Amino acid sequence: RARFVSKKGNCNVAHKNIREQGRFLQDVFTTLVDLKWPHTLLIFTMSFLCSWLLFAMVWWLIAFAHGDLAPGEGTNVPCVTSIHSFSSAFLFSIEVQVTIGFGGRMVTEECPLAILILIVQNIVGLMINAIMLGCIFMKTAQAHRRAETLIFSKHAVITLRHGRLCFMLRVGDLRKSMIISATIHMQVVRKTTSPEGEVVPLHQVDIPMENGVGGNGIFLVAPLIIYHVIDSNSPLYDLAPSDLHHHQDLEIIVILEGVVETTGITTQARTSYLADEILWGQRFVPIVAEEDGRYSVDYSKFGNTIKVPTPLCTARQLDEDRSLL
Amino acid sequence: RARFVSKKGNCNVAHKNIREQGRFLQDVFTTLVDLKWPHTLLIFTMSFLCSWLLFAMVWWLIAFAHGDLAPGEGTNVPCVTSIHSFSSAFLFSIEVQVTIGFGGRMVTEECPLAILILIVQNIVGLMINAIMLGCIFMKTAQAHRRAETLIFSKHAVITLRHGRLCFMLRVGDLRKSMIISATIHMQVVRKTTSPEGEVVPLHQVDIPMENGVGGNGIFLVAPLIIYHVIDSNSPLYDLAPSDLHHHQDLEIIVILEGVVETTGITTQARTSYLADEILWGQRFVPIVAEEDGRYSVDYSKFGNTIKVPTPLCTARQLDEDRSLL
Amino acid sequence: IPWRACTKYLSSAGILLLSLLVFSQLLKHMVLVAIDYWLAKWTD
Amino acid sequence: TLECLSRSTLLCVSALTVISYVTPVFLVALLPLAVVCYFIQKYFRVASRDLQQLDDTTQLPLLSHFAETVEGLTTIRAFRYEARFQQKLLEYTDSNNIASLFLTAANRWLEVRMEYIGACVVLIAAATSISNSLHRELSAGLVGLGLT
Amino acid sequence: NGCFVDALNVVPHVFLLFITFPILFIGWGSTWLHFPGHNLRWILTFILLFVLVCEIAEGILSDHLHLYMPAGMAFMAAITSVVYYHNIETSNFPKLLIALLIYWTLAFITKTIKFVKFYDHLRFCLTGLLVILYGMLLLVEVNVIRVRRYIFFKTPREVKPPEDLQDLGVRFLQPFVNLLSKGTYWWMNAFIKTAHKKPIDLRAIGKLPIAMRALTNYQRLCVAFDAQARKDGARAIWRALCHAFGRRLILSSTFRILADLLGFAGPLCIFGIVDHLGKNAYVLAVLLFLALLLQRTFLQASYYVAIETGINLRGAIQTKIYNKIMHLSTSNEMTAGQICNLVAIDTNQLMWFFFLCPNLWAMPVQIIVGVILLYYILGVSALIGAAVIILLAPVQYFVATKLSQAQRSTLEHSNERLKQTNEMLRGMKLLKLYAWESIFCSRVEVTRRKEMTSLRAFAVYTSISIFMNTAIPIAAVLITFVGHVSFFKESDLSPSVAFASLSLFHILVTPLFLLSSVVRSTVKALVSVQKLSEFLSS
Ligand SMILES: COc1ccc(Cl)cc1C(=O)NCCc1ccc(S(=O)(=O)NC(=O)NC2CCCCC2)cc1
Ligand SMILES: Nc1ncnc2c1ncn2[C@@H]1O[C@H](COP(=O)(O)OP(=O)(O)OP(O)(O)=S)[C@@H](O)[C@H]1O
Numbered sequence A, B: 001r002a003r004f005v006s007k008k009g010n011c012n013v014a015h016k017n018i019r020e021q022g023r024f025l026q027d028v029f030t031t032l033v034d035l036k037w038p039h040t041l042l043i044f045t046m047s048f049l050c051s052w053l054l055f056a057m058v059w060w061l062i063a064f065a066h067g068d069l070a071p072g073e074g075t076n077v078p079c080v081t082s083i084h085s086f087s088s089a090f091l092f093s094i095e096v097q098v099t100i101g102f103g104g105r106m107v108t109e110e111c112p113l114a115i116l117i118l119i120v121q122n123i124v125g126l127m128i129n130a131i132m133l134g135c136i137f138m139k140t141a142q143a144h145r146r147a148e149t150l151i152f153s154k155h156a157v158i159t160l161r162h163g164r165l166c167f168m169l170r171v172g173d174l175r176k177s178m179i180i181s182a183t184i185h186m187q188v189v190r191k192t193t194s195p196e197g198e199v200v201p202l203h204q205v206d207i208p209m210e211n212g213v214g215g216n217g218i219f220l221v222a223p224l225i226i227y228h229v230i231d232s233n234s235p236l237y238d239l240a241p242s243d244l245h246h247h248q249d250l251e252i253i254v255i256l257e258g259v260v261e262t263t264g265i266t267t268q269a270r271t272s273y274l275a276d277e278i279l280w281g282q283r284f285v286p287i288v289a290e291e292d293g294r295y296s297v298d299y300s301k302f303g304n305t306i307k308v309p310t311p312l313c314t315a316r317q318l319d320e321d322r323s324l325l
Numbered sequence C: 001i002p003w004r005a006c007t008k009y010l011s012s013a014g015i016l017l018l019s020l021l022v023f024s025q026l027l028k029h030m031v032l033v034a035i036d037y038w039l040a041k042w043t044d
Numbered sequence D: 001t002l003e004c005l006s007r008s009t010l011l012c013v014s015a016l017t018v019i020s021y022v023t024p025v026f027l028v029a030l031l032p033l034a035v036v037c038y039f040i041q042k043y044f045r046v047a048s049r050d051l052q053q054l055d056d057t058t059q060l061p062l063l064s065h066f067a068e069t070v071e072g073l074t075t076i077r078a079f080r081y082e083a084r085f086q087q088k089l090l091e092y093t094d095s096n097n098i099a100s101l102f103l104t105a106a107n108r109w110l111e112v113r114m115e116y117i118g119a120c121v122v123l124i125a126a127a128t129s130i131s132n133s134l135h136r137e138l139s140a141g142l143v144g145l146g147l148t
Numbered sequence E: 001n002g003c004f005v006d007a008l009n010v011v012p013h014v015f016l017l018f019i020t021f022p023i024l025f026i027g028w029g030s031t032w033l034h035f036p037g038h039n040l041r042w043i044l045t046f047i048l049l050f051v052l053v054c055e056i057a058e059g060i061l062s063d064h065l066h067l068y069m070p071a072g073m074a075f076m077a078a079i080t081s082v083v084y085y086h087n088i089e090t091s092n093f094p095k096l097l098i099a100l101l102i103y104w105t106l107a108f109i110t111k112t113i114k115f116v117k118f119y120d121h122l123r124f125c126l127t128g129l130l131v132i133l134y135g136m137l138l139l140v141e142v143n144v145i146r147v148r149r150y151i152f153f154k155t156p157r158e159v160k161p162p163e164d165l166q167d168l169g170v171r172f173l174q175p176f177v178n179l180l181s182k183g184t185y186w187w188m189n190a191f192i193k194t195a196h197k198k199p200i201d202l203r204a205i206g207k208l209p210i211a212m213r214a215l216t217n218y219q220r221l222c223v224a225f226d227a228q229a230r231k232d233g234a235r236a237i238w239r240a241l242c243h244a245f246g247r248r249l250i251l252s253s254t255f256r257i258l259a260d261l262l263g264f265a266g267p268l269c270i271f272g273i274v275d276h277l278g279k280n281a282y283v284l285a286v287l288l289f290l291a292l293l294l295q296r297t298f299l300q301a302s303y304y305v306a307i308e309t310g311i312n313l314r315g316a317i318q319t320k321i322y323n324k325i326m327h328l329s330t331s332n333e334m335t336a337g338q339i340c341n342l343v344a345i346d347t348n349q350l351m352w353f354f355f356l357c358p359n360l361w362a363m364p365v366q367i368i369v370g371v372i373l374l375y376y377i378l379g380v381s382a383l384i385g386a387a388v389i390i391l392l393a394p395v396q397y398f399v400a401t402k403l404s405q406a407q408r409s410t411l412e413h414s415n416e417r418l419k420q421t422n423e424m425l426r427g428m429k430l431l432k433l434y435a436w437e438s439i440f441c442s443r444v445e446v447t448r449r450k451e452m453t454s455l456r457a458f459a460v461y462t463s464i465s466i467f468m469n470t471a472i473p474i475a476a477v478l479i480t481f482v483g484h485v486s487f488f489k490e491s492d493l494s495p496s497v498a499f500a501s502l503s504l505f506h507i508l509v510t511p512l513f514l515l516s517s518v519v520r521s522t523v524k525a526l527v528s529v530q531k532l533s534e535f536l537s538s
């Protein structure tokens, strides 16, 4: 069946019938500078060579037109001294554009048209150099390779803690760099029909992350199983253990938000758990272990699971039995 | 009548009698660099050409003054060798300023005044180049074209959900890029008179966004109708359904805040709903639909609305009837 | 489909007609090319 | 069909041998392109067979449906169920047409691409014949067979 | 200053080729928006391709790099304009159109300067053709801005790209692709590659566009039938179908005739090449390449358009005769079998006749051009040969008819055999309980021999057909070449004449077979439409 947001974190819902009238502007550069380093280097050298060849062609043309390209001694001074063929013209173009200035071929004060072509060449070169420097620096601020490494266990379990049914699901870090003020927005979607005859195709509702006195955030150093307890007030409290495996369509998504240290940007990780993904009555294997002088975390047992002799019943019927016991 | 903040999100309240004594400083550059790309390119080439022509004029003047401009052989060495007219002077200016250095016309060690004019030319050129590079890079950080695309439905509706009156209003995204930790600050303004004889011209009060156990924020993937239920404690609980359409002056504003992903800046969208804009007793059409293998969202039915046979009465009288039924 | 179905189909015919077909086809095509090959020398 | 396949394959082999004997170097240029055809073969059959059978299937319940309407005609005109049955028949004829349409589209695809290659080969053959068989070989009876 | 004007022409192509590469690399590093004049633009671009090939031929004949560089530059310029219009059709912009318009204007100016400097003194025709094509493309761009919001007032009032072929999952997108792929079927690459791996099914297949359904074709056909019956039959239904399916069929037919012309044209340039070398040939070779590819492309587009018109017609008349099945009376077993044959064989006959309709118009012009062309290459002797090949076409038909007769007889026997089998494969236990099975197998084999006897004559006729197929090509050349040189005028037969005659013989043998099947299909379709009219009007 259809999923809401994929496991990798990307969104699945495809948008249809967007007005699309406003998206008719020139946002050309930034999108090109976001590209991969090889593609971005390719387009940068492409822009540079394009401008260089354009102005080399126009300079060869103007030297041909003035007649200074026609080899002749006397009765004239070439607008650009010592210019002979297209090769020397391209050499002059690259000498004046990238601001090396060899000065073997000299532009003279006889032709103001060469003055104009130089005065536009230099400003366009400076503008393209400025954009191609700002964009590559904005690129070198890419820390996206280090982000999105956060991992959740493939399937989440439910258990019986403190006499109440509880949700257990593993999170964790994958690098030395921490994530500041990471908060959990745990939500559940379902096609719901209101008592007023209204049917919604999908209904997001907040299921709380059960921490201390309050708080929507957590602290991530070691893999910490997020601990929620479904009660009679919780929206998930009504389902059954035998109907979730095959038929029902329930997506439980978690949205872990937090700002990375070095860059300061606020990233997040979204993941879904379907009705066929989640299972019943199990327990994770303890990861942390008292090593020689530290705490050793084994990620091989991260997704491992052991059987637990826990009663299997619906949360509504379990609450009724708690009222009876 | 007068509105508080316009639909587009801009503010309507015009400020009068500002002290304005402090705003007498030179914040010149940043405001020029914020301008449109064509206007900004125009002012950049304008600054460059202005400096170039200024120093070309001063160099022609100094070459004229030393007498080196007077064509003569012997008894002197020109402060700048091979200088003839204003054209070659401007060529020398653009050769030394933008640091190409052709070297056909050579400044000599005979005149220290040319040394001084060069030593100020180069530093002023470097400073103007540095500001005109930093500013264009600060400009290329413009992601404002992608922001503020968030859309709300033109008019909001009220319905009867779970036996209580409720407020329904659509929000939504318009691009692939998400918005992190978007929170809703829903407020209402009204000219209020306290029991102590105090009359306020406008009174902002927080009307809650009804989510799970807590939380002031939401999660935006698909268009999610914000769901609030007015109770006897809510400030909006006292109005009547027949007096809102024409006479009363009630502005209900929503402020949706959130940080975009790629840039990391915290943007927001503010919108108002007047007394004549909001209507009574209706229901939105379900947007999401189970497509081939995904969820299809149709934005044509975004603002569409269907009639619902719901009772029409005031919220105070509705609560009294609930006490009676 | 493998060559086994066609192999059985043609082996039901027998060795008598298999070669009589294949070599005759080869010779017909060789004649059809050789006529034009000789016409090429005919031309000049 | 067996006779036609044999004649076609032997005529093709004969034509390749002719255009090879006419211009030797042209031979070495034609083996690349022919290998291209190999890749065009596989991708074709594994679909051309498939679509084919699909056509057959969309032909079978359609006709049968027709017959069912003819016999129990009085019952269907009595129940006033004519609308739903017309809907079903539009559905069936659409399912037939999509198959019989994709099949002709795929045949056109294979045709056009094989033809583009068959034109590339004559281009290369003529380009080699005009130079090799005239500038150096100076033999005119060759180019005729190759071009034809 | 010829080289000066040549460089002035080289400049704008460089300008466009340099502006395109950043945007092309951004685009290279699912809604199709079409603009007015898209098909016209692609047609004009292909004509530009042809004229640039001609300019390259001129530059080769002249040689001086700077004297033929403009053609090689305009080649890449037109290719990059194609890439630009692809990038604009995939994502619309009001600015890339202006970027193309500027280049069009500059190229027009340069060509005008060339024309003036030539008038003050082969090049003339090519320059004029380029001028005209660039001007028409400029007019197309002006139409686009007049229709778009490029420079027009605030908003463009855009078209809201068509949801007919771009809405909820559809896989067969023929009407909604680039007019080059509408010819070369490039959109099938993805389908066929995915099909190689995953087995196709109706869930993996698309859904038919709104342009071709039961409802659409039924609507057009019933509108034509209404407009024809309000003015009041077999001729009526015929003219109704004709006026209802209209432009598509004649479009296919004219594609077909143009392809036939170019196909008759190929061998003549072969002849010219053969002449030139024995006594201006590279140009003829590249022209042959171009003409081959274009002729075959047009032939294939013709086939497809005809097939699609036929499929439309089948769907239409099928749903129509089903609509008639609702209102018929109960007084009218045999009628049920006749109805289901009216859908299983009569409708297929109608549709296959509509397949072969444009071939019936394009065959006569093909044989006429063939005979007149071969006459001017071989003289009077050609006529004699032109008879022999033509004489195979009626004979073929006769042969075909015999086949049909034989078929009928055979079918009869076959049916009876099946009956004598259906018993044995049902009384299986009864049969084997007393081993009377061999006694019935003897009877079954008795039927089989009669069936075998019919098959001999059928296969004899098949053999005669296959024999004539490759005998008439040999006999034509035999009785023509022997009857030309050693009979009539002893004229020296250059290799060009003989090989052009050979090519034309094959190019004429291929269509000849199809005329017989076309005649049979046409008469059978006429009978089937008379039957459909008799039924549909009871
Ligand atoms: C044998 O070619 C020709 C050569 C020359 C000429 Cl002047 C005409 C034809 C010719 O054939 N006349 C056009 C009409 C026609 C009929 C069949 C074919 S087809 O290619 O054999 N078949 C398909 O495309 N699709 C079939 C169509 C039937 C449903 C199943 C898919 C192609 C075209
Ligand atoms: N040892 C590990 N170290 C780091 N990341 C891991 C490790 N094992 C799994 N992961 C990732 O974190 C997620 C945890 O899921 P698992 O516990 O591995 O269950 P799983 O069924 O084995 O999933 P797999 O290994 O991808 S088939 C997986 O999606 C992995 O991509």
Ligand SMILES: Nc1ncnc2c1ncn2[C@@H]1O[C@H](COP(=O)(O)OP(=O)(O)OP(O)(O)=S)[C@@H](O)[C@H]1O
Residues within 6 Å of the ligand: A017, A018, A019, A020, B151, B152, B153, B154, B155, B299, B300, B302, B303, B304
């Ligand atoms: N299909 C759509 N896609 C994207 N944005 C839309 C779409 N329709 C409307 N919007 C915008 O989001 C807001 C939603 O209001 P609507 O549902 O369109 O009510 P409305 O009375 O039709 O307002 P309009 O269309 O501007 S006259 C509008 O202000 C539009 O600017």
